[PDB]
Amino acid sequence: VHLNKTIQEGDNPDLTAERLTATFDTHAMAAQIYGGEMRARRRREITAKLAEIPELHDSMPLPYMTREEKIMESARKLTVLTQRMSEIIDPTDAGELYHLNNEVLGIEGNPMALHGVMFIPALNAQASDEQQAKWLIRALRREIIGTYAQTEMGHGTNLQNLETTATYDIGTQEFVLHTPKITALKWWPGNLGKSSNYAVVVAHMYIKGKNFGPHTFMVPLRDEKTHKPLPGITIGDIGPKMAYNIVDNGFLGFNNYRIPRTNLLMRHTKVEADGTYIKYMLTGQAIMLSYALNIATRYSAVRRQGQIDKNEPEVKVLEYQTQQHRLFPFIARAYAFQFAGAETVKLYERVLADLHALTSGLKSVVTHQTGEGIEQARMACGGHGYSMASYISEIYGVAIGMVMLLQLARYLVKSAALVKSGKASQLGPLVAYLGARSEPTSLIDRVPNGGITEYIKTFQHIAKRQTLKAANKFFGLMENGEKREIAWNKSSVELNRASRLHTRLFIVEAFARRVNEIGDITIKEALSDLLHLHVNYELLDVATYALEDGFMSSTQLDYVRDQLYFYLQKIRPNAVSLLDSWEFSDRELRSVLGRRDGHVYENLFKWAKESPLNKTDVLPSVDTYLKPMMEKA
Amino acid sequence: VHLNKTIQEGDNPDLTAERLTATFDTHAMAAQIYGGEMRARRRREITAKLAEIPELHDSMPLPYMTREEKIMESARKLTVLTQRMSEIIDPTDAGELYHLNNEVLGIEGNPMALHGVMFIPALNAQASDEQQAKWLIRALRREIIGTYAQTEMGHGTNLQNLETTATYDIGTQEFVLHTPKITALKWWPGNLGKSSNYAVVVAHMYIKGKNFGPHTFMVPLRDEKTHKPLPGITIGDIGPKMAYNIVDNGFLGFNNYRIPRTNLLMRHTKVEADGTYIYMLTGQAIMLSYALNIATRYSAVRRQGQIDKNEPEVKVLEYQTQQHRLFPFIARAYAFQFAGAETVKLYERDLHALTSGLKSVVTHQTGEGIEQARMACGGHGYSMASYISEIYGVAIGGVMLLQLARYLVKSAALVKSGKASQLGPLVAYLGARSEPTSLIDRVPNGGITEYIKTFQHIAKRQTLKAANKFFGLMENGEKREIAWNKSSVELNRASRLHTRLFIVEAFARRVNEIGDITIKEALSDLLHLHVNYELLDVATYALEDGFMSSTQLDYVRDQLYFYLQKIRPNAVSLLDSWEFSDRELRSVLGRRDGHVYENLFKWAKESPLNKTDVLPSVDTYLKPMMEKA
């Protein structure tokens, strides 16, 4: 074998050439990505086992299909799954189930996406033992299809702004559910429009005229025999979307819809008859980014276009510094997000507040940067990237789908207020860098180190400076007599910059922490190169804040630029292998341009010839119109 | 009668309230956008006239339709157009034809998109008088449908790397066309897959062993009676795309396909039997303005959250963060439109080099702003009811920077060798001496020209910097082309900064030329937002050599937040001045009337999946699954 385990006999030599320069075992790196050799190996085994079960394959390429054909096809494979799933995976393992759903069901949705993601978790957390026996067992056994219904046409975020009401009728020990206005319709919950016959519904609970706030209710939506909407229910699909169109996102409305008292989920809240009241997404974005970069980098290895040296043949587009600049920094982010994800789990289980605030900034920054990199990846493909044969446009649309940052801003201002009042020592571990002293300048290129740590210290400085600066603007406006909320709005762009910089600092530290923990020397040097590209690209991307107070000099910025272009060149021999280490099959990746074998051009021609418009040589638009038009002329 | 001419009785008061604060006549601003009162008025008249012709309206909302239904529907409206077009527009005018196609055919394509854009122009420029008489007349009369076929699956657009051959057969006075391998297939020409029965085809011409290089040929593709591909032709659609799916982009291949000698287009080149041999900018501006119309109008009716906790939920247009993500892109939309007009002004009176950077910078900043506009809509922007996603996909579907970099290095080399005085007008700022610092906030006025001078400094510093890196590597013995590649990210930064400097100057030039003072102050506010947002976006280069101080950057930040607040009363009116009808804009969230929520409910109720209460996926699969369990 070669170090790159994805090489095969007959693979486009242009691609194989990029794999043969690998300096590390791609199986070892896969273990590092997915958290152990056993987890990496089980992914590959699951992939091999599916190859032997064609009843679970895409019946035809998904871009060929209409939305109606995708939903039927997804429903078909779903039924085969519930039957054959145990021959392939261990169903208790989330991870094997996630991977199985990627190979079989893809990224565009399925009719039970929210059954396992929201509906069942909600019954674990909120429903009482007695209630779980009745409803959770049926969900687990796929006797019912359900979803979680919270956001409303006019109010998506805050639970405290919802309008749907659940009024307790003491006289009939029932809860009355009502959608008082159009803006109170449940709107967006996946699989609510057509697939689910039950839903856990959030509504404000009223007893004797008092609002006890948001609670959750088990709500029958459709008759279990006929599947038609029950009396009082208004329910349907919200229409087509930019992507993710296999999911039937729903609208839902109630006209004085009555449910029993005991359909209130009552694990932590009780309402008695008389009325008495007693009281992972990150690794998803990483994979999406890695999908698109697999496609664009592999394509860039086989696509030859233009000359550098005019005495030499046309070069792979992977050869241009401009093309490396638009791909390789986003390979680094993909790994950085994955390790930031593992870190938050490691920290979440070390909670045997710093974390919930940081969680907000991550979901936002990771999603924005993933989108930027995916769209960079599509453009790196040139015109062919525009085709659904690249599939990057659908990857973009699924991955991409302001209050998270301002939640972190509140925490950062509260933290800044601790500093300015001499209470630096009360800061949580994740925000203590705010209370620390900066040296007069960055010591990048001015102190020998082997050390990313001078980069981390620079990121700590600018993130700290922007937080204290944005917090001071907010405080200054109040000291001048602005109302608190108006001073906050007038400061809010600056406070978001602070929140992003805090979040991006965490992603760097988490990346660096992982590289330090690795013992395998070839794995460590390859990720060390990735990390060195990361910190230079990110520091350059936020250079304004370092330069603004003299903390960084023009000379040091030229060093960072020289380092950036060096590590582009340094990563190139490993670029394809770093992406092969994520180990996506074709059946999972669903991209002609990103085929494992590199045989783009012959398979792009098969793909086009067999695409729907080519069923007949003469289209109906030419039969009915157009040809009668030419004849008349 | 209000200054804002888009207001109507019955409109959502929340939207009307944003329109009533307008400080200028929106008809006057529309004349300023489209280049005269008569051009603005003709757009509105065309719009009114279509309202009286329902045959040409969308039969149903376009997102409801499959690709196959869109093509039928586009073909239907195309035939009605060829009949009724003269009772609406003057067909000779490209502006009126462009607007008519926007209202009727939209942004997603049509079966004859390249018939008028490439096919007929190609016959004007390359076909002889004799040839035009037989082929151009038929094209003009829509007796044939044609396209222009150049780019190949494996090579793109550089003419010297194409592989389709046209070999002259002296013995039969025919040209033999051949696709020698898969990568030589014509691939991407719009309307080539299914619609066109003719095409002008680029191929390398061979006479007796010798390659005379790329020439163009009139090539029959499909029989005029049956529309089936002629013997030797391989032709079809390349498959679905991320957007623009009404166009049937094609692949085309030849197996020793023979055409007469006189199908070579022979206006400027002749081959005898003997064998002898003798703007897009305004388009992107409009797309950006589409999306901002949608997101800003939506932001006027969409209430969400509180500022003051004793007051009702505020329009999201109220948050500085939402103004920051919309208003700078309103400024760009106007800036691109004026940069476009300037480019025409200069073209009719260096320029070709600048043209490259504009096509690239305008397209990418337009994409950034359109996607920014979609996110400003929140979750509802994800629906096709916003339509911004399709706007993005069509707009983004438009080496350009390199062409400008070569010009900027050639310019920088003139400076370094003491030949500053030989620089063209558009690039002379490179030879000029900078003052020790920026004088923003440092002089009693100075105004926009101090911003322009700062942009000239940083664009000049990055060009000279990137050019020196390239020269330095050669002075150290690198081959020219390798030194170029190693410098090419820096050289692209230089090209963008040059291009963005031009957009600023053009914007400023227009504001100076305007006499109408209410129009001038509204665009002056837009310009002041522009220069602060742009200078802040490229602040690194100003700070790097001490040319700007931290204090001056805080001034720019205070100016940015001031002009956000200053522009808000005019934001909706600045976008209404582009004067897009609903039939053109095709967005539920961006409805002229502001009645989003009622019409989003109508749109969803009447969407395809709601034809029946029970889907076939539930009948065939999901309910048998639940029953079994």
Curated annotation (Swiss-Prot), chain A:
Reported consequences of knocking out the gene: RNAi-mediated knockdown abolishes production of dauer pheromone daumone 2, severely reduces production of daumone 3 and increases production of daumone 1.
Inducing factors: Induced by high temperatures (25 degrees Celsius).
Outcome reported for the amino acid change (mutating residue 323 to A): Loss of ATP and FAD binding
Reaction(s) this enzyme catalyzes, per UniProt: nonanoyl-CoA + O2 = (2E)-nonenoyl-CoA + H2O2; dodecanoyl-CoA + O2 = (2E)-dodecenoyl-CoA + H2O2; a 2,3-saturated acyl-CoA + O2 = a (2E)-enoyl-CoA + H2O2; heptanoyl-CoA + O2 = (2E)-heptenoyl-CoA + H2O2
Annotated effect of mutating residue 117 to A: Shows catalytic activity toward asc-omega-C5-CoA without affecting activity toward asc-C9-CoA, asc-omega-C7-CoA or fatty acyl-CoA
Effect of residue 244 to F: Shows catalytic activity toward asc-omega-C5-CoA without affecting activity toward asc-C9-CoA, asc-omega-C7-CoA or fatty acyl-CoA
Residue pairs linked by disulfide bridges in the UniProt entry: none
Gene Ontology molecular function: any one: fatty acid binding
Catalytic activity, EC: 1.3.3.-, 1.3.3.6
Keywords: ATP-binding, FAD, Fatty acid metabolism, Flavoprotein, Lipid metabolism, Nucleotide-binding, Oxidoreductase, Peroxisome
Top-level enzyme category: oxidoreductase
Pfam (any one): Acyl-CoA_ox_N
Pathway recorded for this protein: Lipid metabolism; peroxisomal fatty acid beta-oxidation
GO cellular component terms, semicolon-separated: peroxisomal matrix; peroxisome
Cofactor: FAD
Residues that, per the record, bind ATP: 325, 364, 368, 376, 497-500, 545
Residues holding FAD: 148-151, 156-157, 190, 303, 323-326, 383
Regulation: Activated by ATP. ATP binding leads to a conformational change that promotes FAD cofactor binding and enzyme activity. ATP binding likely occurs during acox-1.1 folding and/or dimer formation.
PANTHER family according to UniProt: ACYL-COENZYME A OXIDASE ACOX-1.1, ELECTRON TRANSPORT OXIDOREDUCTASE
Function per UniProt: Involved in the first step of peroxisomal beta-oxidation by catalyzing the desaturation of fatty acid-derived side chains. Specifically, catalyzes the desaturation of fatty acids heptanoyl-CoA (C7), nonanoyl-CoA (C9), dodecanoyl-CoA (C12) and to a lesser extent pentanoyl-CoA (C5) and hexadecanoyl-CoA (C16), and hydroxylated fatty acid hydroxynonanoyl-CoA. Also, catalyzes the desaturation fatty acid-derived side chains of ascaroside pheromones, which regulates development and behavior.
SUBUNIT field: Homodimer. Forms a heterodimer with acox-1.2. Forms a heterodimer with acox-1.3; the interaction may be important for the stability of acox-1.3.
Protein name: Acyl-coenzyme A oxidase acox-1.1
Source species taxonomy: Eukaryota, Metazoa, Ecdysozoa, Nematoda, Chromadorea
